[PDB]
Every structure is written in structure tokens, then in C-alpha cells.
Amino acid sequence: KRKEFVGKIFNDATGQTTVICALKKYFEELMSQGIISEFNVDIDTELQATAKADEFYWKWDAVKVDVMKKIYGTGYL
Amino acid sequence: EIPGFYNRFKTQAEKSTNTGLKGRLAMPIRANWGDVGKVVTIKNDLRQLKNLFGDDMNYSAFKLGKLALLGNVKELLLYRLVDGNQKKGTLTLKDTTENSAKDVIKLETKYPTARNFNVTIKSNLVDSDKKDFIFFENTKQLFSSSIKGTIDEIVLEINSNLDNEYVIATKVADSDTILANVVNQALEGGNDGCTSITNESYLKALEEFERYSFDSFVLDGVADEALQETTKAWVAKNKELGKDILLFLGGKTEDNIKQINDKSKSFNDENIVNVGSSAYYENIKYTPSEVAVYIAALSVSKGITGSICNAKTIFEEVEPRLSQSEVKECLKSGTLVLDFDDGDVIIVDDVNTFKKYVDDKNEAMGYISNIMFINTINKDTSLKRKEFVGKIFNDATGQTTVICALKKYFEELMSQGIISEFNVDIDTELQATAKADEFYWKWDAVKVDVMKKIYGTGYL
Numbered sequence: 459k460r461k462e463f464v465g466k467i468f469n470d471a472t473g474q475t476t477v478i479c480a481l482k483k484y485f486e487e488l489m490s491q492g493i494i495s496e497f498n499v500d501i502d503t504e505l506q507a508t509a510k511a512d513e514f515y516w517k518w519d520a521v522k523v524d525v526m527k528k529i530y531g532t533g534y535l
Numbered sequence: 536e537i538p539g540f541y542n543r544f545k546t547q548a549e550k551s552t553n554t555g556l557k558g559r560l561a562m563p564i565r566a567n568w569g570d571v572g573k574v575v576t577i578k579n580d581l582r583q584l585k586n587l588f589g590d591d592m593n594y595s596a597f598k599l600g601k602l603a604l605l606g607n608v609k610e611l612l613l614y615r616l617v618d619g620n621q622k623k624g625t626l627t628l629k630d631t632t633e634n635s636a637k638d639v640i641k642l643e644t645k646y647p648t649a650r651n652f653n654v655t656i657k658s659n660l661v662d663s664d665k666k667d668f669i670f671f672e673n674t675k676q677l678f679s680s681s682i683k684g685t686i687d688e689i690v691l692e693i694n695s696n697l698d699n700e701y702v703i704a705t706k707v708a709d710s711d712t713i714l715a716n717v718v719n720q721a722l723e724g725g726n727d728g729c730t731s732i733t734n735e736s737y738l739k740a741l742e743e744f745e746r747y748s749f750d751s752f753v754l755d756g757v758a759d760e761a762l763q764e765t766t767k768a769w770v771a772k773n774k775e776l777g778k779d780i781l782l783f784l785g786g787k788t789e790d791n792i793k794q795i796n797d798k799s800k801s802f803n804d805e806n807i808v809n810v811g812s813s814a815y816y817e818n819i820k821y822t823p824s825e826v827a828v829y830i831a832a833l834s835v836s837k838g839i840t841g842s843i844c845n846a847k848t849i850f851e852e853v854e855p856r857l858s859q860s861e862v863k864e865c866l867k868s869g870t871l872v873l874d875f876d877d878g879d880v881i882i883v884d885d886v887n888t889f890k891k892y893v894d895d896k897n898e899a900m901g902y903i904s905n906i907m908f909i910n911t912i913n914k915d916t917s918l919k920r921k922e923f924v925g926k927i928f929n930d931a932t933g934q935t936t937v938i939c940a941l942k943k944y945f946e947e948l949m950s951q952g953i954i955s956e957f958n959v960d961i962d963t964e965l966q967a968t969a970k971a972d973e974f975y976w977k978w979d980a981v982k983v984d985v986m987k988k989i990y991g992t993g994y995l
Contacts, residue, residue: 492928523928524972527936531916532962533909534979535899 459484474501474514485518496521549710556609557807558835562828563740564588564730566596566615568648574743577611579604588613589650592819594729599756599828604823605849614743616736616755617728623647624725626654630713639686639710642702642722643695647725652677652701653719666714668692670699674719677701684713724870737762741769748914750835750907751781756825758787766908770806777917779901779910784832784888785810792861795823796868802888803869805900809888810953811865812873814850826850830871830882834903839911839953842904845884848873861980866890866971869901884987899982908953908982913942934961935972945978957983 459480467473481499488494499518506515556579568589569575573612577583577600584600592598596615603611628640644652651673659665664684670677678698682689686706693704702722737755744752754766763784784802786795786809795811802809810827813820821829829850834843853873857865862883865872867889874881890901899905919940927933941959948954959978968974 492932497928523930525926525928526924526933526972526974527708528970528973529920529924530965530973530975532975532977533912534977535897535905535909535982 564596603832607836622726624722630712785827799870815852
């Protein structure tokens, strides 16, 4: 995505929104595959406040879907 | 392939099948004949046992194998026990063309043994250069052959026909000279298999047996105590490692019923079954462990959908013989003992050594059939491990799929009637505490019982 967004959109609210929307679409594609159980992606307003005008900061959390490695069963008769 | 109409006929087992067999059993054995140092599976035809380990009843191998096969096990797994000195028989042949005769062929038994496998070589009466090679065991002829006086063709023919499977021929030298005549010369240098067999050999055999999976183990029909504790610990380890192996044992012939009951008290793990009674089948006695082989074989052949509490035995006599007081004493002790309730010898009950204790491991656990059921459920579940572990994502869909598969399995069990009632569900108590990469689940069931006791009251 660097080449899609770097040097091609103006760092205004519109450009930031477009970048966030594209990343959200990608993560929602991942969600549709079920790989991720939960996620959120948002602007890193903490670092964006300190960001220079020609740069952008963003944050995202996710939860990869696990797999059974261990399984335990208990029986009653 | 090229165009055409190419038939490939497959009438190999059209209706040559029957379903009267089940189960598999482990067997450390002492044998005069057969393979050494490997765990070999034997199909229930005793001819296979006779071929692959001989027909000598002086050895644990053939006798306990026959008992197990009469127990109707689907596949009997054997292991020949030996001391390191145990050896193959051997014989050497020499030429006669040269005055300084040179060894040119050596004959060695195909399997380690000490039996008197004998060989004869004589001048061929038809062809001048041919020698008639004949093979015996104590003069009982196995195979005869005739080859011209070149060593390569001689050894190739002797190794070619499977009628000569008892012995292997190897070339000592590349001679084209006339062989020396021998008459019933035994393949000496071999050693038997009953030579200095100790607990270490059994330990090695058990370590070999760790590879495989079994329905029961019986320990060679030998009642040596230290071997019994060793096998007890070994089975406990196997259970903790997810291998659900059942063990049958038999006390010494010298032990009184009190001593047998004391030993059956000493054993209290559910996978331990102690056998007290001795028996005769072909007018030949069998120690409690030798018949423990047969009872384990019959139990595994029964599988699920059956029991042993009144299964008829092949034995023509049983001893020592018990009144109802003695029978009740033995059952309370957890001992399993045969009985003569009718003109045949009949198994008294389904009990195991655990039965001395009651409540936590329930009274049904005191019966062998319940243990076989639980081990089977554990085995099928531990088969499902590979289907489900590391292959589905722990989401609600994966949990539902696992639960649905287990429900289908238990419903298959219900269709067979083995279970009267069951439910299987997620263990939400432990699932709440479960780590994200694991799953917990619970199930209740009710195995269908069998009449052991019946009572009738009459009115006239």
C-alpha cells in the first residue's frame, strides 16, 4: 500500500480518511476469511499530533483466530 | 491409457468373509523357532503361528499362541524373547575334487534355534555330477533337490525353493568342484531361546511393545512378581502417555486362594486383572497366567457388545474349585477365577483387581467390560485428535464441528444399543478458564448393562 498512498495524497483529512478506509477494507476482508476474530484500526492521534506535516501515523489492534493445539475431555458414565 | 475397453477382474474376496473375530493382543514369548527381536503380527490361523514360530508345546510361544488364537483374537502380536547368546544353527559343506578339500557352502537355519535340523547330500543316481540335497529335522524330511556340481547353482537352488525355508545356503568359495556327501548332519552351533531368560529380556520386549497399540497384555504366561510390578508401572506410564493398555495377570500355581486374593488386593489399578484358577484343555494343565493369556484373548475378542461373566471356555477341567463362599471371597478380592457351573468350565464374572474399592472409580469400573468401553472411547477420541488438533480455528464454528462429530460418534454408539442414554456438550465451566488455543468439553453416558444375576418366583 505504500506505493498507492505515499507521495500521491495530500495528508489532509480526506487523504487520511481514504487511507484509513482502505486499511479498514483490507482488515474487513481478513475478517470475512475468519482469520481475525476482532480488530480496530484508527489514526494514531498521539503520534499524529507530533507528526510532521509530510507524514502520517496510524494504529491498529487485532485478534488472530487461534487453533486447537491442546484438547481435554472428561467422561461420565 | 490408449483407447479401448480394458477389463480388470477383482473377484478376490467376493463373499469369502466372516465377522467372528476382533481385537489384538501383545505377547512376549520364549520360542525355539521364529524371528527374534521384532514384534510380528499373527493372523488367527494357527498354521501361521506353527510356520513362523514352530509347533513345540514345551515353549511359551506355541502354547500361549494356541490359547490366544482359540481366544479368537483378530490379530495376535508376538515377540520372541532371547538371551544375547541365543544363536542360529549352522552346517558347512566341502568339496571332494581337490585333495586339500576347501569349504564351499555353508548352511544356516533361517531363524535362530537349537533344534536338530539335519541335511543329507548323496551322489545322484541319474546324472554323474549331480548331488541330491535332502533336508530333515530329526530325520523327518523337509525337502529334497538335485543340482549339478557347481556351487553357485547349488546355493541358488537351495535358497530358491520355499520348501527349504528352514535353512539359508551361502557360498563360501567360488568352486566348480564336486561336493562332499553328508548324511543327516545337524545344523549345529545354534542356541534355543529358553537359555538364561531374565527380567531384562522382558523389559526389552516391553520397550519394543511401546511402539504398537494393543487391547490387552498378559506377560508371557509367567507369574514372576518383579516382572508384574514392572509391567504395572509400564502400563501406568502408557496410560498417562495416552496409550490405554489393559493388563491381565495370573498368580503362581503354589499360591493359595488366600494368597491370590492378597495379590488381587495388592493390584488395584483398573487395568490389572489377576487370575487364580488353573485349568486343563487337552488333558494338560495350565497355570493361572497361562489361562490368563486365554481369558485376555477372549476378552479382547469380545470387544464391546459383550462380556465374559459367563462365557464358555475351552478348558475340560478347572482347579482349584470353589464353593460360593470362596467365589464371593475371590470376587470381593477382585480376583477372576474360572468355575465349573456346568459340565464345562465357565468364567465366573467380569471382575478385575480394582473391584476391592467401590465408589470413586465406580463399581462398573470393577468390571472389565466397562474398562474396555472407556479405553475404546479414549482411543477413538485420541484418534479424533489428529482430525481436529491444529486444523480448526477454536471459533464457534470449530467448536460446533467438533461437538457435532462427537455427537455423531455417540449416536453411532446409540444405534448399536451399547449406550442407553448420553449427552455431550461444551465444558463451559472449564471453557471460560480455557486458554484461547485450547478446548474443553464434557459428556455423560449410560452403558447398557447385562444380566449377571436373575431371580424368579413361582406361583401354583
